[PDB]
Structures are given as C-alpha cells and as structure tokens.
Design a protein around this nucleic acid. Structure first.
Lengths: 99, 177, 94, 39, 117, 82, 41, 156, 40, 130
RNA sequence: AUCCCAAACAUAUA
RNA sequence: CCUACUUCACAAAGCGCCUUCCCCCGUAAAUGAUAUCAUCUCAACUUAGAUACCCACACCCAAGAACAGGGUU
C-alpha cells in the first residue's frame, strides 16, 4: 500500500526539489524565483521545472541567459506600469499569437 | 571544464567557507542566511542525502541588536531534569552569560529537525568579537552582505548633507535651548 | 570511444612535460601556473584551482585537493584543449 | 503563471490548446508525416 | 430550516453601468451560453446535484453550450454559484459542414473556424 | 556589456530578438579569469573519533562501526551511473 | 536482452554537459590579487 | 514636485531605465548577425536541445538515450525526427523559442532501439476493519530512443 | 478551555486571512458576472 | 540658527510637515528631520513654537524617542545593549514568562503605532507586533 | 496544579 | 569521623563529636520634556549590582555484590 501511495509523493517532492534548485541558481544571479518563472512565462518561454533545474546544474550560463532575460522582462513590466498614460510596449513584452 | 572525472566531482561538491559580519544585525536575519547556507540550499546541486553543507563563520555576535524591546522581553527556557530546575532567563542575561548563544539558538531553531542538525551546527563557527583564529581566517572565501542596513547617526552625517537638508521651521528670535 | 574521455584511453604520466614539449614545438614559452580559486586551505578537504597561463592569457585551469594535483590536472585540461579533444567537441558524424 | 495567459487570450494551461499540443510530435526521417496522436 | 432559495428578480435587472462594464449589448442579446463548472457538487444539496447532472456539467472546467431560453436560465439561476457562464460570441458566422471538423474555441469566449494546427 | 542588472559579477550575456519576433538569441561567451586577479603558487579508540570529528567537522556518531545486519544489506556491486 | 528490472533514470546522457558542470565558483566574482576576505596583504 | 531625501520617500529598489528602442533594435540586429556568422562558419561544438517529445520535456544531446512510457507504433531501428524543439544551445550561444523553433533552424533526429514493457508494478489498496484488500499488477509499455544528431542551421 | 476546543462558550475564533478574503472576492465577482449574463 | 528656506513646495499646508509634502514620508532613521525638532537635551520642543499638528507632533515625538533608544543622537545626551524601534522604555517592560498557546499569544511590540499610515513598499505590510 | 513552548523577521516592487 | 561517653571492641554505630560561605540585579535619590514652572525615567539620563571538588597473573585492603579501585620497596 505504501509502494502505491508513494508515487504521488514522488511527483510532489521531486517538484519541490526542482523548485529549490531553481531558487538556488536564481538567487545566485540576483533574481528570486517568483520573478524568474513568472516573468519568464510572460515571454512565452514555456519551459518546465525539470529542464530549468537540469540547466542550473549541467549548463550554467544558458541558465544565466534565461535569468538575464527574466530580469529584462521584469524591468520592462515595471517600466510599463510606471507609464502614466499611453506608452509603446517594450521589446520583449510583445506577445506572439497563434491560431 | 572538460576536467577528468574525479576532479570534476570534487569541484562540484567541494564546500566553501563563508564569513558573515554581525555588528548591529538582528540575530534572526543572520540566522536565516546561516540556515540556508549550512544545509546547502544555495547550491543548485542540493539534496538532503548528498550532504552538501557549507561552512559559516559569524563574527561580532556580541553586538547583535534585537528589535523593539526584545532584550527585556524575550526569554529562553531550559530545564535540567532535576526538580526546581526550570530556569528561564531573559535575553540580556543570556547575552551577558555567554554572548554566542542567541545566534546559536536562532540557527538551531531554523535548521531542519533531523539527525543532520548536529553536523550543520558543528560546521557553524561563532566568534564574539573581531578576533578569529588564523587557521580559520585563511580558509575563508566570501563575505555575505549585511542584511540590515546600519542607519548611521548625526556623527557621520557630514556638513554637506546637514546643510543640504532644508531647514523646515523658523524659531523666534529669542529662545532658551 | 564515446563517453570515454581522452586520457582514460591514452595512458600517459607526467602531463606537464608533454605540455611544455607541445608548446615549445609551437614556439611558445613554458606556461606559468598560478592560483585562481582557493577554498578551505588548512582543512583536510581543500579545493585548489590552478590556472596555467601563456604570457598574460589563460589556456586552462583545473581543480584538485592539492595545488600539485591541481597543476597536473590543469595540465591535462590544457593538453586536451590544444589537441582538440575536449568534452565540448562536435560529436562524431555518423 | 496563468492569469496573465488568460488576459492575453491563451489557454491558462500550456498543455491545453496551443503550439505545444496541437502540432505533431514527430515525423519519419525522409519527411513523410506519421499518423496523428490519439489525443 | 434550510430550503431552496428564491432569488428576487431585481437581482437580474442589469444596469447601464453593468452594460459598460462587461461586454454589454442589451438589444441584439446573445444567443447561446458557454457554461463551465468551477465548484464541487458535494457539500451542496441534492437538487443542485441533479441540475448539474441535467445541464451536462459533470466534469469541472469542461465547457458545455446551452440556449439562452428562460427555462435554462431558470435552471442556471440556482446553480449559478457553481458555474461560470460566458457568451459564445461568433465574430464570423457559425461553421458550414465542410469546415466543421476544423474549428476550435478560444478562452475569450469565441468559436473560430481558422484552426490550422 | 549592457548592465540593467550588473552583468559583471560573473560574465556578460547579450540578448536579442530575431527580426520577426519568433526566436530569441542570446550570446554568452566564456569570460576568462584575469591574471592580475590571481595569486602565485606557494612553493586510542575514543580520541580517534574525537580527532576525526574535528578534522572533518562531522559529529562523532557516524564513526563507530555497524553490526553485521547493517553490513550484509549493503550492496557490494552497485549499478554504475554513466 | 537486459533484465526487465527497474530503470532508475529515464535517460543515460553519456556527456551530460556542453557548457561546463557547476562548481561553487561559477557565478562568484574574483578580487584584486586574490584576497580572501578581511585580509590585508 | 519635490521631496527631501529620506529613507522611505524614494523607492528602495534601484530604478533602472530601459535603453532607447531604436538603438536597442540596432544592437539586437548586430548581435543576431554575430550569432549568425558563428553558426554559418562552424564555431559551435556539441549541442543540447530541450525538446517536448510526446509527453513532457527532455534535455537531449547527441548519442544519448531517452525512455518514453508508451508505445510509438514504429518498427525497430526506424529513423525519426522530433519536432517541437524549444531550446538549442552550444558552448557560446543558445536559442530559445517563443515557444517553439521553426523546423528549419533546428533538426533533431532519433532512432528507436528497443521496445519493452516496464517491470511489474503493484497497485494494492487496503482499508482497516472493512475487509477491503485489493491487489493488481500493472506493466506499462515503454520504448527507448537513441538521439542521433542535432543539426542547427544558419537561417536567422 | 473545557473540552472539544473548537466549540463551547470559550471557543477559539478562527482568523480571516487576507488570501481567504481575496478568494471570497474572486468567487463573488464571478457571481456578479453570472448575474449579468442571466439578465438578458 | 534654523530659518525657513525660500522654496517650500506646498505653502500654507495643514502643518509644517504638510508644507513640505512629507506627512507620510518619514521613519525613525531620518535623523535630520528629527534634529530640526529637538532641543539640545534630547526632549523636543512645544508644538506651539514649531507649529506642528497634533498627529504629526505625536509622530515626531515617538520618532525622537525611538531614535534616542537606538543610539542615533549621541551628541544630544542630557550632559551596553543596542536596539532599534524600541517601543517601550526598557525600564518598564517585563519578561514574557508565560506566552500563551497558538491562539492567545502575547508578542513583543516593535515599531510604533503612529506609523501605520507610512508608505508601504513590500506587499506584506509592516508587522508592528512580533 | 511535571517544563516557556516554532526559530525568526516592522520596507526590494503580489 | 571515632579521641573520649555510650551498644560493642583490628571495626560498625548514636544518644557523642566537628564544618556549613557567595556581596546575588529590589528598591529610592537627584537634573529635566513634550506640558519652558512643575514631575523617580510605559523619555532621554549618574549610583547603592562565587567558588570549591575530580584530572597520570597471584596476595592483601581502611575498595568491593560480580567487575572495578588502593598497596606488594
């Protein structure tokens, strides 16, 4: 019964491990984890957590690239919010659509 | 990169020393930073079963600054098994008795509550004042930032900002002061 | 030879000798070694990073638990980089 | 994050409708496509 | 005692402020509803369960379409606290038979024919 | 070298969009560690546990041996990863 | 022919890095002449 | 519109400002041209591709193996190509899609090496005092794919 | 505290967090939209 | 001696803090704002002479107190354990020997209650009682 | 009425 | 602990002897503010505020249930 009921915990706490690892790398590059994954999903880079953690380990400066991209998007978002009126959108903030 | 196998493993899992000033910092924030660093939750390689803890060295723990009135109010409780041994002591008293115990107990509370807590608390080093043994000082690598920004007082406010800050009211011609 | 690194297949000893031999065959000075990163110098689990240099430019670095093993493995690293047999090489094209 | 995805007119769940799930996931080497997914 | 609920009809006299708030169109009112369940049938009385079995809403977050007749409105008006109903706007007319197997639905509430994968 | 975030702690990475907008290209070269930032090479069964406890900084518990039951269950020929 | 017993990793990436595996000094700066903190000379 | 300097009148976060859009576009054009000449010449080495094949995301490189938890309707040793590549990277550059990358800028091949069924896994349900004791054996089917090559192409 | 601590005259009243209130408001706004789309 | 500068942005306000668009823009760390409302011996001036309002007078008084007990005006003594945001004077606060269970805890005050309407920048507000 | 009982933290863009 | 007294008499004992400590954080006194006088301070501000003990086979013993411990010059 434990061998059965443990598969759901397997998924649960492996996702927790990946979230912790990504938080470690993100803190290495100056960005908390909420900001990273949120503002990265706000650029249609639909990358899941397993690959992000595996990139934190086995590919450090492509992770640096993704973190820099996230910080860029965050700054563009804060600039847009600071826009008190009508403002052109940022350069990465643009949304690509598909039918 | 492109190292050999064993040197690559040693590079990955090697453990880095960390100094951490403590002057005019609240014990809890030092405790939080030390808690994350001791158990390895700053390495992307983290895992509980890997034991990737990294050493930590706090200094100036005598100049810890609790917030509010926590010196008078916060009380730490201990009890030897012998009757009447329920003793509990304020923070000021425990600071005078042994001025490395507030930060020690904070880091002890935050760490995970398992049979790895003792290893992590052994890899913590706490030194009350700026002194530090040389065989430790020549192991250090990094100096983590001070969490609380120490608000400087009038004494180090140079005249440029004293007179640049606008005078905001007009006392009458005559006054005692 | 897939996955097998170079020097697990080409069993040599005394790498820095072959390094200076190759760099002299290319008419360049014997490379000068320095200490890049150091963590835990006194304890029994140290990490020393030794970087070989070629007249103010760096051609490899390597980790070890002694400055000497670090020297040796940084030599192995540089020797790999020169011979175009690193781990980032283009995979064989089948 | 999926509230932002909705205020931009996307499926809140990237495994919903979008490029990621609609398009085929493989093709024979020469180029002739392959029978679609049962999903 | 607990009972059913009779909502006074004054709750359904939409104001002009409501009209300009949501995608209002009082005249030329919309034809269909797309309805999705967002709460559990359990911990809720039995007639709510029966209604949520009558309107096809078994699985949550699975959208189902219905008319805007006052009968179906009188059914929805007692499970309204378990459903999100959005108009099914049709910017281009409802599909023809040849291009019907190649249609799809967008989260904004629109049914669209131009869905090439 | 653009530094909204101070891309100097580690190295510098440059971000850009292809002309249309459906691909993002980032350029990250391996920044090399400078020379003038470098340094030159410099050219008995209870006390046993206590000394190993101070040298490796682990606590005393793990150093005592374990019984036969906890040493026939150990795997002699474990699988080799990679 | 391999035994049908459990499979631990869904992958066997024999060269699992292209960009340099992580050691604690990636992303950590360097200082003038290699001064560990609080030093003088 | 003036405030004397104070610890909380200003925002603690350091207010950055974005670059000018036209110069920003010129910079972006320059760097993409640089990466384009790098790809055209042959600077790169090995390549890693983050791929979305058939359930979920795999980080894949040449020569390696990937275990999929379902059948794929393909004879043994029958070459295949994996569309839906959402990251491809080398030593010096990496390209991310938004979300995906066109079928011309990245080409990921593959082959099927073996088709197996997983080890016999157990589903047992149990409840106390109710004589509820269910047992079942499940054998999921699996197929293992050898990734062969990842060819990037200059089309940017 | 007499027993069955969640009831009695000296019961312990639970606190209303901010995110619970935010969830209440989310459901309630959805209800307002339902009221509209059943109003025609 | 202190005077009035020729550029008060918002002249004729509710109080000389409102005459500088400050009413919710000072903490205890603002040493000079307090120093402009202090005698040479630590205790601050009557509100009549300065012209301050009731609430802002109270706020500057409390800020002066917390600034003293933090050790931020050492040249204002009337002639060691280091704190900040010391609400109550340390001579009249007792230890918390009996802190209740989860649901009736007694917690150590921090900050001052006259600074709730300050600007807030982290989304989780100031947590006065700790 | 055996022994207080989570360690902490007023502010980095929800 | 056994010198005497006392049951007893290589000793164990009491009804017989000798030793027993450490200022231990509690109080008020002044100057003085918002509230210019006035007021001990949920304002700042000067003061009445522990040791000691232990540490390197066999035969007897003031050490011992066995094992331990002191002695064998």
């Amino acid at each position: 019964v434990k061998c059965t009921k443990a598969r759901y915990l397997k998924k649960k706490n492996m996702r927790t491990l990946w979230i912790n690892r990504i938080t470690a790398a993100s803190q290495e590059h100056g960005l908390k984890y909420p900001a990273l994954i949120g503002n990265l999903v706000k650029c249609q880079v639909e990358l899941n957590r397993k690959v992000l953690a595996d990139l934190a380990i086995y590919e450090p400066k492509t992770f640096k690239s993704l973190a820099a991209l996230a910080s860029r998007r965050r700054h563009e978002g804060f600039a847009a919010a600071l826009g008190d009126g009508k403002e052109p959108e940022g350069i990465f903030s643009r949304v690509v659509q598909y039918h | 990169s492109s190292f050999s196998r064993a040197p690559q493993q040693w590079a990955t899992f090697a453990r880095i020393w960390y100094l951490l000033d403590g002057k005019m910092q609240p014990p809890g924030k030092l405790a939080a930073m030390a808690s994350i660093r001791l158990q390895g939750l700053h390495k992307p390689v983290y895992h509980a079963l890997s034991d990737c803890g990294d050493h930590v060295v706090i200094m100036n723990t005598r100049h810890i600054a609790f917030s509010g009135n926590k010196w008078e109010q916060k009380v730490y409780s201990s009890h030897t098994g012998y009757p009447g041994g329920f003793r509990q002591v304020t923070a000021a008293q425990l600071h005078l008795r042994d001025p490395v115990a507030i930060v020690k107990l904070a880091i002890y509370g935050m760490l995970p509550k398992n049979l790895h807590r003792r290893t992590m608390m052994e890899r913590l080093h706490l030194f009350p004042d700026e002194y530090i043994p040389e065989d430790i000082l020549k192991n250090l690598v990094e100096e983590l930032p001070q969490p609380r920004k120490i608000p400087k007082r009038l004494d180090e406010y140079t005249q440029e900002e004293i007179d640049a800050f606008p005078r905001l009211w007009t006392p009458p011609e005559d006054y005692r002061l | 030879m897939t996955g097998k690194e170079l020097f697990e297949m080409w069993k040599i000893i005394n790498p820095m000798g072959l390094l200076v031999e190759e760099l002299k065959k290319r008419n360049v000075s014997a490379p000068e070694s320095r200490l890049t990163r150091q963590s835990g110098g006194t304890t029994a689990l140290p990490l020393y990073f030794v970087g070989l240099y070629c007249d103010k430019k760096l051609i490899a670095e390597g980790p070890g638990e002694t400055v000497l093993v670090a020297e040796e493995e940084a030599a192995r690293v540089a020797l790999r980089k020169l011979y175009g047999f690193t781990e980032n090489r283009r995979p064989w094209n089948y | 994050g999926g509230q932002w995805r909705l205020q931009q007119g996307l499926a809140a769940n990237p495994s919903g409708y979008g490029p990621l799930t609609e398009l085929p996931d493989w093709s024979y080497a020469d180029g002739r496509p392959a029978p679609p997914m049962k999903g | 005692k607990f009972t059913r609920s009779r909502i006074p009809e004054k709750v359904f006299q939409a104001s002009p402020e409501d009209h300009e708030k949501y995608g209002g169109d009082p005249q030329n009112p919309h034809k269909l509803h797309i309805v999705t369940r967002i709460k559990s049938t359990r911990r809720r009385p039995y007639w709510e369960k029966d209604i949520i079995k009558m309107l096809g809403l078994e699985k949550a977050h699975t959208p189902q379409v219905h008319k805007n007749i006052p009968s179906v409105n009188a059914k929805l008006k007692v499970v309204k606290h378990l459903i999100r109903i959005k108009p099914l706007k049709l910017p281009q007319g409802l599909p023809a038979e040849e291009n019907m197997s190649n249609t799809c639905l967008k989260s904004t509430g629109e049914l669209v024919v131009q869905w090439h994968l | 070298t653009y530094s909204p975030l101070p891309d100097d702690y580690n190295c510098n990475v440059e971000l850009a969009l292809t002309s249309d907008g459906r691909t993002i290209v980032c350029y990250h070269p391996s920044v090399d560690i400078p020379y003038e930032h470098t340094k030159p090479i410099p050219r008995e069964e209870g006390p046993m546990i206590e000394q190993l406890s101070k040298m490796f900084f682990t606590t005393k518990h793990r150093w005592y041996p374990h019984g036969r039951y906890h040493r026939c269950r150990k795997n002699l020929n474990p699988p080799k990863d990679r | 022919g391999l035994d049908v017993i459990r499979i631990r990793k869904p992958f066997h990436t024999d060269n699992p890095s292209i960009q340099g595996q992580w050691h604690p000094f990636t992303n950590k700066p360097t200082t003038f002449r290699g001064l560990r903190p609080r030093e003088v000379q | 519109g003036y405030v004397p300097k104070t610890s909380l009148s200003s925002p603690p976060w350091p207010e950055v400002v974005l670059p000018d859009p036209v110069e920003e576009t010129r910079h972006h054009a320059e760097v993409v041209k640089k990466v384009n000449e790098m790809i055209v010449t042959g600077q790169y080495g090995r390549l890693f591709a983050v791929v979305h094949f058939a359930s979920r995301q795999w980080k894949v490189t040449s020569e390696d193996l990937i275990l999929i938890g379902n059948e794929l309707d393909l004879a043994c040793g029958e070459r295949i190509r994996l569309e839906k590549v959402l990251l491809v990277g080398a030593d010096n550059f990496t390209l991310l899609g938004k979300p995906l990358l066109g079928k011309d800028l990245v080409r990921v091949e593959a082959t099927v090496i073996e088709k197996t069924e997983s080890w016999p896994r157990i589903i047992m349900r149990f409840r106390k005092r109710k004589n509820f004791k269910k047992k079942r054996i499940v054998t999921t089917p699996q197929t293992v794919l050898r990734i062969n090559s990842i060819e990037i192409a200059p089309c940017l | 505290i007499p027993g069955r601590q969640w009831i009695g005259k000296h019961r312990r009243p639970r606190f209303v967090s901010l995110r619970a209130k935010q969830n209440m408001i989310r459901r309630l706004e959805i209800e307002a939209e339902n009221h509209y789309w059943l109003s025609m | 001696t202190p005077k009035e500068s020729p550029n008060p942005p918002n002249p004729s306000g509710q109080c000389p803090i409102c005459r500088w668009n400050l009413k919710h823009k000072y903490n205890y760390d603002d040493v000079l704002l307090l120093s402009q409302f202090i005698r040479p011996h630590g205790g601050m001036l009557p509100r009549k002479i300065t012209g301050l309002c009731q609430e802002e007078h109270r706020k500057i008084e409390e800020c002066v107190k917390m600034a003293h007990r933090a050790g931020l005006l050492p040249n204002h003594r009337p002639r060691q354990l280091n704190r900040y945001l010391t609400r109550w004077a340390p001579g009249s606060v007792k230890p918390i020997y009996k802190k209740g269970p989860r649901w009736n805890r007694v917690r150590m005050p921090v900050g001052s209650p006259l600074l709730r309407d300050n600007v807030c920048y982290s989304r989780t507000p100031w947590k006065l009682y700790h």
